[PDB]
């Protein structure tokens, strides 16, 4: 006892030849609703991996055992299930996996995924200027945009009201603003965290979302409710090292171009004084990025694959596009 | 020191069919907040040693108690219930009485035995179809329906609208029919769990009370009132057929006359698939699986009763 074969049944049909062991990993709803918070996510993420790689790569199966062994839930769970079907940009998860509980092991069959998407992802890592939500591109969306920036191809930057704050020499504690957060004009306060991590982690999001929607203006040091000018500390920061930080921040975003130009992402950074009252309080930082040719990542898509040979990989940004739409 | 003779106390004779349960905690207080899989466990042990007593005359089931310190003088109200599940009179107070002597805890289960069942049991195996109760006969219902069936030897075949469905030749969705969910039909649709398995897991209910019950038809797939199948690349059309006979086929049935048949039904299998099955009304009796019942004696153990053997004790 205690020995499962590895697939028992009476169907003689051809076996799964790729197959994925996510080692032990508790299942139910009742079990995974009161477990350990941090064990819930890393095997939600470890299956989601698993189920992404299979989709992309032909089919077949994802082997794991109970750590809750007696009780034989039958059922995935919630988490799993709308993490599984969120990959599916269909939505039909019932179409796609396949679940089979034997004695000790259970089994995830996900059958192969080849107007719609070509390639299942966890996260597009693609970000547009959207009021409605700030939450990445899905399925659906990612693919109407990249095929359309690819069929484009075969100011208002200056214009706009955030110009002459942009283009101001020294500003003054507490100061009222006339714009508000539109379209093209992100606020963004600083807090306790050091300034240029800070700058560091809302770059890659907001400067990508600013690049494929008409570009922007994105400003640290602005409160959202208060809407006043209250910049971050000058003694711990200067101007050649916020500007450094950006400039180190928006070279790490990969690009992808359906056409000839291989121009990265074109922005204008600017440090501005923050007087209290005739001493410097600190500075405020504004950060001007132009419209983009194609696509502006604000890192690689969070999308999986999985080969005998090579085992489960990430994909790379541009191969990652070329697998998305027909290049 | 930590040392008790069984049965101390001056008024006591000690019974015979003495029957040991491992260590179990006891108390209302205690039971309700002790580990969820082990507190099933010990009922299942305790309802089981109460259900094998019962059948087999007098007997006591002992047990040493977890929670040693405090002294309860209640079993709890799960055990309560269970054992009232026991009892057809669900009278308790008559055939279990409970002493507690140090560290250890009795239960004194009554011999058991108008017209009511003979034998004791925790489930009868055997379903019919009740509207808004699709729960397994009880002690009472499976002894009327049981004398019911043995005084009928010693003494619709209709075709349902199913029956379209069930020769349709092909399908797809919405096809929702003059027919709904009837007393003759049900449905039950998959979801992400594999073909095989659920149909293994419902068959025997389902078809042990439609077979009871003028018989019907079983569709697998259908939410809603609407069809939805199963997916093609797991299962082929051969493996349905096959995991449904063998399914059946262990399904227990008795005969109260000389037909050893077993009951007859037959599977179709519907392409882009749908699983229907057409079985038709029984002879006497069948049974989703054996019935859940126990006796006790020293030389045999605590030993389970076959199919057999447990309808005869309801009969004279
Ligand atoms: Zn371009
Ligand atoms: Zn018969």
């Given at each position: 006892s205690?020995?499962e074969?590895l697939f028992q049944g ?5 076996s ?8 032990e990993v ?7 609703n ?12 470890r299956?989601?991996?698993a189920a ?6 032909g089919?077949?199966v994802?082997?794991?055992q ?7 839930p039958?059922?995935?769970?919630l ?6 079907r969120?990959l599916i ?5 019932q ?5 089979k509980?034997?004695?000790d ?11 719609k998407?070509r390639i299942?992802?966890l996260?597009?890592?693609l ?6 939500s ?9 693919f109407?945009?990249?095929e359309?920036?690819?069929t ?7 214009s706009?009201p ?10 003054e504690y507490?100061?009222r ?5 539109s ?16 700058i560091?982690?809302?770059?890659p ?12 203006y994105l400003?640290f ?6 809407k006043?000018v209250?910049?971050?500390?000058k ?14 921040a928006?070279?790490?975003?990969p690009?992808?171009?359906?056409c ?7 922005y204008?950074?600017r440090?501005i004084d923050?007087?209290?009252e ?8 504004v950060?001007?990025?132009e419209?983009?040719?194609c696509?502006?990542?604000?890192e690689a898509?969070?999308?999986?694959m999985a080969?005998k040979?090579?085992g489960?990989?990430?994909?790379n ?11």
């Amino acid at each position: 006892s205690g020995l499962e074969v590895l697939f028992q049944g009476p169907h003689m049909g051809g076996s799964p030849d790729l197959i994925i062991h996510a080692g032990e990993v508790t299942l139910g709803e009742k079990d995974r609703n009161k477990m350990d918070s941090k064990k819930k996510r890393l095997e939600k993420a470890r299956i989601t991996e698993a189920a992404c790689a299979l989709l992309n790569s032909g089919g077949g199966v994802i082997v794991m055992q109970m750590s809750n062994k007696s009780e034989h839930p039958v059922e995935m769970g919630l988490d799993l299930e709308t993490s599984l079907r969120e990959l599916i940009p269909s939505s039909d998860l019932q179409a796609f996996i396949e679940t089979k509980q034997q004695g000790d092991l259970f089994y995830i069959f996900v059958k192969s995924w080849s107007t719609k998407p070509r390639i299942c992802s966890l996260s597009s890592s693609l970000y547009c200027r959207s009021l409605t939500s700030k939450l990445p591109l899905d399925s659906k969306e990612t693919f109407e945009f990249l095929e359309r920036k690819k069929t484009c191809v075969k100011n208002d930057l200056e214009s706009n009201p955030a110009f002459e704050i942009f283009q101001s020499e020294r500003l003054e504690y507490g100061q009222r603003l006339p714009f508000s957060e539109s379209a093209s004009i992100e606020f963004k306060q600083f807090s306790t965290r050091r300034a240029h991590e800070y700058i560091k982690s809302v770059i890659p999001e907001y400067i990508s979302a600013f690049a494929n929607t008409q570009g922007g203006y994105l400003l640290f040091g602005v409160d959202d409710e208060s809407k006043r000018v209250l910049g971050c500390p000058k003694d711990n920061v200067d101007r050649d090292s916020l500007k450094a930080v950006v400039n180190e921040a928006i070279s790490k975003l990969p690009v992808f171009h359906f056409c000839s130009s291989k121009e990265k992402v074109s922005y204008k950074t600017r440090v501005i004084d923050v007087f209290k009252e005739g001493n410097l309080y600190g500075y405020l930082c504004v950060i001007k990025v132009e419209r983009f040719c194609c696509a502006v990542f604000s890192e690689a898509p969070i999308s999986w694959m999985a080969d005998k040979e090579n085992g489960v990989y990430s994909l790379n940004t541009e191969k990652w596009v070329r697998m998305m739409v027909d290049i």
